[PDB]
Design a protein around this ligand. Structure first.
Ligand SMILES: *[C@@H]1O[C@H](CO)[C@@H](O[C@@H]2O[C@H](CO)[C@@H](O[C@@H]3O[C@H](CO)[C@@H](O)[C@H](O[C@H]4O[C@H](CO)[C@@H](O)[C@H](O)[C@@H]4O)[C@@H]3O)[C@H](O)[C@H]2NC(C)=O)[C@H](O)[C@H]1NC(C)=O
Ligand SMILES: *[C@@H]1O[C@H](CO)[C@@H](O[C@@H]2O[C@H](CO)[C@@H](O[C@@H]3O[C@H](CO)[C@@H](O)[C@H](O[C@H]4O[C@H](CO)[C@@H](O)[C@H](O)[C@@H]4O)[C@@H]3O)[C@H](O)[C@H]2NC(C)=O)[C@H](O)[C@H]1NC(C)=O
Ligand SMILES: *[C@@H]1O[C@H](CO)[C@@H](O[C@@H]2O[C@H](CO)[C@@H](O)[C@H](O)[C@H]2NC(C)=O)[C@H](O)[C@H]1NC(C)=O
Ligand SMILES: *[C@@H]1O[C@H](CO)[C@@H](O[C@@H]2O[C@H](CO)[C@@H](O)[C@H](O)[C@H]2NC(C)=O)[C@H](O)[C@H]1NC(C)=O
Ligand SMILES: *[C@@H]1O[C@H](CO)[C@@H](O[C@@H]2O[C@H](CO)[C@@H](O)[C@H](O)[C@H]2NC(C)=O)[C@H](O)[C@H]1NC(C)=O
Ligand SMILES: *[C@@H]1O[C@H](CO)[C@@H](O[C@@H]2O[C@H](CO)[C@@H](O)[C@H](O)[C@H]2NC(C)=O)[C@H](O)[C@H]1NC(C)=O
Ligand SMILES: *[C@@H]1O[C@H](CO)[C@@H](O[C@@H]2O[C@H](CO)[C@@H](O)[C@H](O)[C@H]2NC(C)=O)[C@H](O)[C@H]1NC(C)=O
Ligand SMILES: *[C@@H]1O[C@H](CO)[C@@H](O[C@@H]2O[C@H](CO)[C@@H](O)[C@H](O)[C@H]2NC(C)=O)[C@H](O)[C@H]1NC(C)=O
Ligand SMILES: *[C@@H]1O[C@H](CO)[C@@H](O)[C@H](O)[C@H]1NC(C)=O
Ligand SMILES: *[C@@H]1O[C@H](CO)[C@@H](O)[C@H](O)[C@H]1NC(C)=O
Ligand SMILES: *[C@@H]1O[C@H](CO)[C@@H](O)[C@H](O)[C@H]1NC(C)=O
Ligand SMILES: *[C@@H]1O[C@H](CO)[C@@H](O)[C@H](O)[C@H]1NC(C)=O
Ligand SMILES: *[C@@H]1O[C@H](CO)[C@@H](O)[C@H](O)[C@H]1NC(C)=O
Ligand SMILES: *[C@@H]1O[C@H](CO)[C@@H](O)[C@H](O)[C@H]1NC(C)=O
Ligand SMILES: NS(=O)(=O)N[C@@H](CCC(=O)O)C(=O)O
Ligand SMILES: NS(=O)(=O)N[C@@H](CCC(=O)O)C(=O)O
Ligand SMILES: [Ca+2]
Ligand SMILES: [Ca+2]
Ligand SMILES: [Cl-]
Ligand SMILES: [Cl-]
Ligand SMILES: [Zn+2]
Ligand SMILES: [Zn+2]
Ligand SMILES: [Zn+2]
Ligand SMILES: [Zn+2]
Lengths: 691, 691
C-alpha cells in the first residue's frame, strides 16, 4: 500500500547523513557562486527524485558583506591615538578546513560604515528591561556611548534597535560563556562548546516582516522599483560588530563607573561587569574605537521550488520549506534541516514513481538569503501572494532539524495541535530509556505542558524564520518541529560560527542520525497528513481553548491598572463575548464536520478549515507594522524570536504607566480590544453555516 | 420548467408600480423612524415572498441633520449688518404633499457649523481645471472668499475639497438651469424640469471608501471604538449650503471683478457670470453671509439582508443590493430601484415555493444611509469582509432603475461584458420604434461603443454608489444597469429634490412601467445567470482587451512628456509585457474552460474565475487612499462618480509639470508602473494551470 507508513518507512537515517555531508563541505553564503551551484544541484536532484516541476525563482535583494581588503575590527585606543589592543580579524578555522577559502569573517550584516570612538557602557543583554534598569533606575545615559551587550535571550536586531533608541553611537555584541559554554563540555573540536575565538554572525535588521529592505510589498524582480538606501526598511543607523569572549574579556576587564546592579547582569568571565561609562581610573583616557567598512549590495538570490501535483485538489497547496543559505558551512543551520527536506522529497518521489500522488499539491522550497532577513521566502510569497492567499492550506518550516538531542520542540498554530499529538503517538521515540515507547510519551515526559497534565508543551510561533511571511502576513496555518536541548532564544554554543560543521553533528549531536530521522518523520508525516487526509487535519476547538487562555492573560495585564480601567471605562467584555461565541460556533462546526459522500460539503468544509487561520488577518496590519497582520499572534516587539498573543493590546498596555497622556494611551488600549474582539467574532462567523 | 425564462416571465410591471407607490408616500430619511418602519416592512415581505432568512443588520454611524429650530440660510448683508436678501428655508412642497411632515429642508450633509461673511468668487463647476483657470491663468485668489459653484459634472464632495484647498471660507452650491432645465419641458408638477425654488440635497464628504467617518476599517457595532470628530474621515472644514436658481440669480446678479474667461463658464441665468471677487461698484460694501447650524450625530441605521440558500454551492454568494434611504420621497432615487429589487425577490420566491433553488446562494440587500456616504453597505461589508473575500462571486447594484427613458446604461467589470451582451440579445426592447427587436439592438443603436462597430457602450465603474466597497475595496466582480437620458454625472433635473415623487415617475418617466420592467429583467437576469450557470459567466479575455486599451491610454498621457521620460528612464515595457502575458494566459485558460463531468476541475476553474477580480486588489491600497485597493480601477481623484483606469499611474502623472521636484515625481510614476505591471502579471498567473 501507499499510505503514511509506506512514506515514513522509506525515510533513511543513512541518506540524511549522506546529504548533510554533501551540503556542508564548502560555505554557501547567500549571493555567492557556491550557493547558486548548490541551488542548481538541488534542483537537478529533486527532478531525478520524481517531482513534476522544479524551478529556480530568483530575486535581486539588498545583502551585506565585509570589505575583503579593509577588514572590520575594534580597538582600545590610548590618548595618543595608538591602537593598543585589536579584536581578531577571523575565527581560527577548524581542523582540516584551515585552507577553505571564502569563509566570511565575523560581521553584523547590514551594519552601516563608521569609525565611532567613545566610552563603553555595558548593557547586559540589551533587552528593553535592561535599558529601563540603566536609564530609569541607575540614571546612566547611553547617549554618545558605545554599548557592549552579550548575545542571548532576544533577537540581536532588537538589541541594536534598543541601543539606537538609547542614543548609542555603536554596538559591540559578544558571546559570554555564561550563555554559550555548557559546564563540563569541551570546546570545539573536542566537544560542542564555543571556544574563546568563536564568534556568532547574524543580521541586525528590524524588518518587521518586510522582506528585501528596498522593495516592501512587492517582489524584487527584474523591473522592480527600489527605495533609495535612506528610505530602506529596517537598517540600523549605528555601526555594530560581534566578537568572541577572549576579545570581550579584553574590552570588559578595564570597565569602571557603576557596579552591575545585581547578579543577573554578571556572566562567567573573570571581570567585574561594571556598567561604566568608561574605564577605571588608570585607563580613563583610553577609548574604544570601531572600524566598520561593510557594504550593502543588491545581489541575486535563488530559491528552488519543487511541485508534486495533487491528484484530486491540485489547487490546494501544502508547503514544506526551509533555507539553504548558511553563514559558513551550515553543519546545523540550515543543512541539518535541508538534508531532512531532501530525504522527504526523495521518499515522496519514490511513492510517486510507483503511481501514487498526494490528494493535494505539495510544494517543496529551498529558500535563499534567510540569514539576511527571511528574504527568499518573503520575496517569493510577495510574488505569489494571491495564489497562496486563496490556495494555501499549510506551511511546515524546515530549518535546523537538531539544535540539541534532548527532546522534541514544536511551535505551531493551535489548528495543528491535534495533528501533532496524533502523529507523535504513532512514531517511535529515539531517546535513550524510551526504546519501544512513542515519541509522544518521551516528549511529554521531558517537556510537560504547563497547562495540562499528560500533554506536551507546544509554543506559539514567533518569527526569526521563513514561516513568518506565510503565517503573520498571509495567515496560512504554519508549524515547525525540531530536536532541542534541555536559553531557548539564545541558540546552541556554536550557532552561526565557523565551527558549525558536519563533524560537529556527526561526532557530538547525532552520530546515528536517529534524531534527524525522527524529525524527518514528524515534518514529513505532518506534510503527508495535510496533503492526503480527506478532511483537513485541523481542530478549530483547539483555537477556542487558547483564545480563552490569551484573553485571560491580556485581561490580567490590564488589571494591574484598576484605577485607570475605572476612569477610562476599559472593558474586556467584548473580547470575552467573542471568545465564548468562537467556542460555541467551533463546537457546532466540529459536530457538522463529523456528521456529513458529498464532495461539495466536504470542500466547503475544508475551505472553512483552510480559511480559518486566514480570518485572523487584519488587512490594515498592526500599528506601524503593516506586514504583521495576524491579530492573535505577532513577533514580540521586544524579541522577534518570541511570539506574543493579542499583540495589538499587549503593545498598547506595555509600559503604559510611563505614557504622558494616559487618556490617549488607554483610548488606544480600548481601540485594540475592539479590533481583537471584532476579529475573533469575524473568524468565528466563518465557521457558521454558510447560508 | 424552472429556468431563466420562467424567472423573467414572472416579473410584472404592475407589481413594480404598486411597490413604487407604496415606497414613496412618506419620506424615508436615513436614521428616521419612518425608514426603520420601512425596513421592518421589507423584512416581513421578503419572508412572505419565500426567502430562507431575512435579518436586519444595524450600525450606529455618523449622520448629519439641520437644526429644526435654527434653520440654515444665506444672506446678502449690507455694511450696517442688515440682511437685505435671504435664501429660502424650504422648497415649496409639491401638490397634495404640502401637509407632509418631516420633509428635511435642503442642506449639505456633514457641513460644519459657522457664520462666515465675505466676498463671493464664482468658480464655475468647482472642478480641478476650474480652479487651475482661476488661480493660474486669471490670478484670482480664493483665500478667505466664499465660493459659489454650480452643481454638475463632478461629485459635489470633490467641489468642496477643491474649494477648501483653494482657501475658501465657505461654499454655496446651486442648480443652474443650463444643467438642470431641459429646453422645451415644463417645471414640476407639469413636467420633469426643476423649478427655481427646487434644491438638490446631498452629502459633501470625501470618504475615499472609508464608510462611517468614525470607524474606518471596522463595523460600527455596539462595542466599536470611535474616532473623535477631529480625527473623523472625510468631513469638510468649511460651511456649505445648496440653493435653487431663483436664489442663485440674486447672489450672482451683483457680481463684479473679472468677466467669465469664456462661454463654458456661463450658465443660462440672466447674469454676467462675473467671477468676482465681490460685487460691482454700487454694491461693493455688501457681503454674503452663511448661517449653518446643522449637527453631526451618531445614529442607528438598518440594512435588510435576505438569503436564498444555494442548492449546490451555498458557500458562493451572488449579491443584489441597492439602497432604501432617500432624501425626501425617493420617487426615483432610490425607490425606482428598490421596487425592482422587491419584484425580483418576489419572482425568485415564487420559483422557490415550487421547489426550485438557485445553484449558488443569492443575498438580497436593502442598504441604509447610502445618501450619507454609502454607510450601510460599507459597514456590513466591513463586518463580513472575510466571508465576502472568500465566497463573493458578484455584486449587482440596484439604485434608481430609471433616470431617463432613452436607453440602457451599463457600468461593470470587463468580466461581465459577455454576460450583458448575451442577456440583452434575449430581452425585448421596450423602446418606441424597436417593437419586436432585442434590447441589445436598441441599446447598441442609441449608445454605440466608441471602440467597436455593432457593440454598445459599457462604462467603467466609478463610485458614488453601494457597489464601491464590494468592487474597489474587496475586489468582487460588480455591475449596474439602469435606463438613462440622451450631463452624465450631473443627474436629472429633480435629483435629490422634494419634487422626486411617485407622480414624477408615473406621469413623466414611465407610465406603463415598461422601462422599470426591462431594468428588472436585466438586473434579475444577471443575478439569475451568476447564481445558476454551471460555469461562472465571466470571460477573462474581455479583461485582456481592456487592459491593453488602458495601457495604451496611460502610456499616451506619459508621452506628452518625452524629455522627462528620456531623463528619468521611464519605461512602460513591463506593463505592456504583463498585459501581453495576461492576454496569452487568459486565451489558454479559456480553451481549458471549454475543454473539461469533473466537479473539482469545474470548481477549481470557477474559483479561478471568481478570484480573478480579487487578484487586482493590492493589500497596501492606493497612495493615501487605503480603501481603494483595486489597481486597475478607482474612483477619479477629481470626481468620485467617474472611474479612472490605472489610477495609481494616472494620479502620479496628473499635473506632473507643476511638481517642484521632477526627479521625485517621475520616480513615483515609475513606482506606479511597477506596481501595475506586477499586479497584472500576478492576476494573469491566477489563471495559469494550478500545479
Ligand atoms: C456573541 O454572539 C451573540 C449572539 O448570540 C451576540 O449577541 C448580540 O449582541 C448584540 C450587542 O449586544 C445585540 O445588540 C442588540 O440588538 C438589539 C436588536 O436586536 C438592539 O435593540 C440593542 O440596542 C439597544 O440596547 C443597547 C445596549 O443597552 C443600547 O446601546 C442601544 O442604544 C439600544 O437601546 C443591541 O444593539 C444583538 O441583538 C445580539 N444578537 C443576538 C442575540 O442574536 C454578540 O454580539 C456576540 N459577541 C460579539 C463580540 O460579537
Ligand atoms: C511575461 O512572461 C514572460 C515569460 O514568458 C516573462 O519572461 C521572463 O522575463 C524575465 C525578466 O526579463 C526573465 O528574467 C531573466 O531570467 C534569466 C534566468 O532565466 C536571467 O539570467 C536574466 O538576468 C540577466 O539579464 C538581465 C537583463 O539584461 C540582467 O539585468 C541580469 O543582471 C542578468 O544578467 C533575467 O533575470 C525570465 O527568464 C523570463 N522567464 C521566462 C522566459 O520564462 C516576463 O517577465 C513576463 N512579464 C512580466 C511583467 O512579468
Ligand atoms: C554532492 O552530491 C552531488 C550529486 O551527487 C555531486 O554533484 C555531482 O558530481 C558528479 C561528479 O563530479 C557530477 O558528474 C554530477 O554532474 C554532479 N551532479 C549534480 C550536480 O546533480 C557533488 O559533487 C557532491 N558534492 C560534494 C562536495 O560531495
Ligand atoms: C591594531 O591595528 C592597527 C591597524 O593595522 C595598528 O596600527 C597601525 O600600525 C601600522 C604599522 O605599525 C602603522 O603604519 C599604522 O599607521 C597604524 N594604523 C592605525 C590606524 O593606527 C596597530 O598597531 C594594531 N595594534 C596592535 C596592538 O596590534
Ligand atoms: C486525532 O485522533 C483522535 C482519536 O482518533 C481523532 O478523534 C476522533 O475522530 C473520529 C473521526 O471524526 C471521531 O469519530 C472520534 O470520536 C474522535 N475521537 C475523539 C475526539 O476522542 C481526531 O480527529 C484526530 N485529530 C486529527 C485527525 O486532527
Ligand atoms: C405598503 O404596503 C404594506 C404591506 O402591504 C402596508 O403595510 C401593511 O398594512 C396593513 C394595513 O395597515 C397592516 O395590517 C399590515 O401589518 C402591514 N404589513 C406589513 C407592514 O408587512 C403599508 O400600509 C403600505 N403603505 C402604504 C403607504 O401604502
Ligand atoms: C433675513 O432674516 C433675518 C433673520 O431672521 C432678518 O433679520 C432679523 O429681523 C428681526 C425682526 O425684524 C430682528 O429682530 C433680528 O435682529 C434680525 N436678525 C438678524 C440676524 O439680522 C432679516 O430681516 C431678513 N431679511 C429679509 C430681507 O427678509
Ligand atoms: C455568450 O454567448 C456566446 C455564443 O453562444 C457564448 O460563446 C459560445 O460558448 C460555447 C460554450 O463554451 C462555445 O462552444 C462557443 O464556441 C462559443 N461561441 C463563441 C465564442 O462565439 C459565450 O460563452 C456566452 N458568454 C457567457 C456565457 O458569458
Ligand atoms: C574596500 O576597501 C578597499 C581597500 O581599502 C577600497 O579600495 C574599496 O573602495 C572598498 N570596497 C568597497 C567599498 O566595496
Ligand atoms: C543624555 O545625554 C545627552 C547629553 O549630551 C542629553 O542631551 C540628553 O538629554 C540626556 N538624557 C538624559 C535622560 O539624561
Ligand atoms: C547528545 O546526547 C548525549 C547524551 O546526553 C551527550 O553525550 C551530548 O551532550 C548530547 N549532545 C549535545 C550536543 O547536547
Ligand atoms: C438647535 O437650535 C436650538 C434653538 O436655537 C438650540 O437651542 C439647540 O442648541 C440646537 N440644537 C442642537 C445643536 O442640536
Ligand atoms: C492668496 O491669499 C492670501 C492673502 O491673505 C495669501 O496668504 C496667499 O499667499 C495668496 N496666494 C496667492 C497664490 O496669491
Ligand atoms: C419619456 O419619453 C417620452 C418620449 O421621448 C417623452 O415624452 C419624455 O420627455 C421622456 N421623459 C423623460 C423624463 O425623459
Ligand atoms: N537561521 S536562523 O538563525 O534561524 N534565522 C536568522 C535570521 C532571522 C531573521 O532575520 O528574522 C537569525 O536568527 O539570525
Ligand atoms: N443616491 S446617489 O445619488 O446615487 N449617491 C449619493 C451618495 C454617493 C456617495 O456618498 O458616494 C450621491 O451621489 O449624493
Ligand atoms: Ca519585496
Ligand atoms: Ca466602519
Ligand atoms: Cl524549523
Ligand atoms: Cl445602480
Ligand atoms: Zn537557519
Ligand atoms: Zn541562521
Ligand atoms: Zn441613490
Ligand atoms: Zn441619492
Amino acid at each position: 500500500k501507499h499510505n503514511m507508513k509506506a512514506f515514513l518507512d522509506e525515510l533513511k537515517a543513512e541518506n540524511i547523513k549522506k546529504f548533510l555531508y554533501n551540503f556542508t563541505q564548502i560555505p554557501h553564503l547567500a549571493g555567492t557562486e557556491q550557493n547558486f551551484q548548490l541551488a542548481k544541484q538541488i534542483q537537478s536532484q529533486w527532478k531525478e527524485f520524481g517531482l513534476d516541476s522544479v524551478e529556480l525563482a530568483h530575486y535581486d535583494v539588498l545583502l551585506s558583506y565585509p570589505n575583503k581588503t579593509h577588514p572590520n575590527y575594534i580597538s582600545i585606543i590610548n590618548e595618543d591615538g595608538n591602537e593598543i589592543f585589536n579584536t581578531s580579524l577571523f575565527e581560527p578555522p577548524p581542523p582540516g578546513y584551515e585552507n577553505v577559502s571564502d569563509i566570511v569573517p565575523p560581521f553584523s550584516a547590514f551594519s552601516p560604515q563608521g569609525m565611532p570612538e567613545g566610552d563603553l557602557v555595558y548593557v547586559n543583554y540589551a533587552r528593553t528591561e535592561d535599558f529601563f534598569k540603566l536609564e530609569r533606575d541607575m540614571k546612566i545615559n547611553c547617549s554618545g556611548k558605545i554599548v557592549i551587550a552579550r548575545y542571548g535571550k532576544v533577537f540581536r536586531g532588537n538589541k541594536v534597535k534598543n541601543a539606537q533608541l538609547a542614543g548609542a553611537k555603536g554596538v559591540i555584541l559578544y558571546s559570554d560563556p555564561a550563555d554559550y559554554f555548557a559546564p563540563g563540555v569541551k570546546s570545539y573540536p573536542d566537544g560542542w562548546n564555543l571556544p574563546g575565538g568563536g564568534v556568532q554572525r547574524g543580521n541586525i535588521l528590524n524588518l518587521n516582516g518586510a522582506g528585501d529592505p528596498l522593495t516592501p510589498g512587492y517582489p524584487a524582480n527584474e523591473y522592480a522599483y527600489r527605495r533609495g538606501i535612506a528610505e530602506a526598511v529596517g537598517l540600523p543607523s549605528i555601526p555594530v560588530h560581534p566578537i568572541g569572549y577572549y576579545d570581550a574579556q579584553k574590552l570588559l576587564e578595564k570597565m569602571g563607573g557603576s557596579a552591575p546592579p545585581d547578579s543577573s547582569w554578571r556572566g562567567s568571565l573573570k571581570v567585574p561587569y561594571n556598567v561604566g561609562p568608561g574605564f577605571t581610573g588608570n585607563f580613563s583616557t583610553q577609548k574604544v574605537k570601531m572600524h566598520i567598512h561593510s557594504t550593502n549590495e543588491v545581489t541575486r538570490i535563488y530559491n528552488v521550488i519543487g511541485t508534486l501535483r495533487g491528484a484530486v485538489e491540485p489547487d490546494r497547496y501544502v508547503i514544506l520549506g526551509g533555507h539553504r543559505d548558511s553563514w559558513v558551512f551550515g553543519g546545523i543551520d540550515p543543512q541539518s534541516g535541508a538534508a531532512v527536506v531532501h530525504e522527504i522529497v526523495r521518499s515522496f518521489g519514490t511513492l510517486k514513481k510507483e503511481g501514487w500522488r498526494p490528494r493535494r499539491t505539495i510544494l517543496f522550497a529551498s529558500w535563499d538569503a534567510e540569514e539576511f532577513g527571511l528574504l527568499g521566502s518573503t520575496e517569493w510569497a510577495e510574488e505569489n501572494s494571491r495564489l497562496l492567499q486563496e490556495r494555501g492550506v499549510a506551511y511546515i518550516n524546515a530549518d535546523s532539524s537538531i539544535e540539541g538531542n534532548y527532546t522534541l520542540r514544536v511551535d505551531c498554530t493551535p489548528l495543528m495541535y491535534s495533528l501533532v499529538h496524533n502523529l507523535t503517538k504513532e512514531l517511535k521515540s529515539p531517546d535513550e530509556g524510551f526504546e519501544g515507547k512513542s515519541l509522544y510519551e518521551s516528549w511529554t515526559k521531558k517537556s510537560p505542558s504547563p497547562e495540562f497534565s499528560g500533554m506536551p508543551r507546544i509554543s506559539k510561533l514567533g518569527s526569526g524564520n521563513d514561516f513568518e511571511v506565510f503565517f503573520q502576513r498571509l495567515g496560512i496555518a504554519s508549524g515547525r518541529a525540531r530536536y532541542t536541548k534541555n536559553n531557548k532564544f539564545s541558540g546552541y554554543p556554536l550557532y552561526h560560527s565557523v565551527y558549525e560543521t558536519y563533524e560537529l553533528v556527526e561526532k557530538f549531536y547525532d552520530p546515528m542520525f536517529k534524531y534527524h530521522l525522527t524529525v524527518a518523520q514528524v515534518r514529513g508525516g505532518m506534510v503527508f497528513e495535510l496533503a492526503n487526509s480527506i478532511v483537513l487535519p485541523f481542530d478549530c476547538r483547539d483555537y477556542a481553548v487558547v483564545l480563552r487562555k490569551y484573553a485571560d492573560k491580556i485581561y490580567s495585564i490590564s488589571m494591574k491598572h484598576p484605577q485607570e480601567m475605572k476612569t477610562y471605562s476599559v472593558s474586556f467584555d467584548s473580547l470575552f463575548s467573542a471568545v465564548k461565541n468562537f467556542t460555541e460556533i467551533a463546537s457546532k462546526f466540529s459536530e457538522r464536520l463529523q456528521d456529513f459522500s458529498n464532495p461539495i460539503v466536504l470542500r466547503m468544509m475544508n475551505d472553512q478549515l483552510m480559511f480559518l487561520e486566514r480570518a485572523f488577518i487584519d488587512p490594515l496590519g498592526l500599528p506601524d507594522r503593516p506586514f504583521y497582520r495576524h491579530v492573535i499572534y505577532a513577533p514580540s516587539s521586544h524579541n522577534k524570536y518570541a511570539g506574543e498573543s493579542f499583540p495589538g493590546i499587549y503593545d498598547a498596555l506595555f509600559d503604559i504607566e510611563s505614557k504622558v497622556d494616559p487618556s490617549k494611551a488607554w483610548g488606544e488600549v480600548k481601540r485594540q480590544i475592539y479590533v481583537a474582539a471584532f476579529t475573533v467574532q469575524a473568524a468565528a462567523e466563518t465557521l457558521s453555516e454558510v447560508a
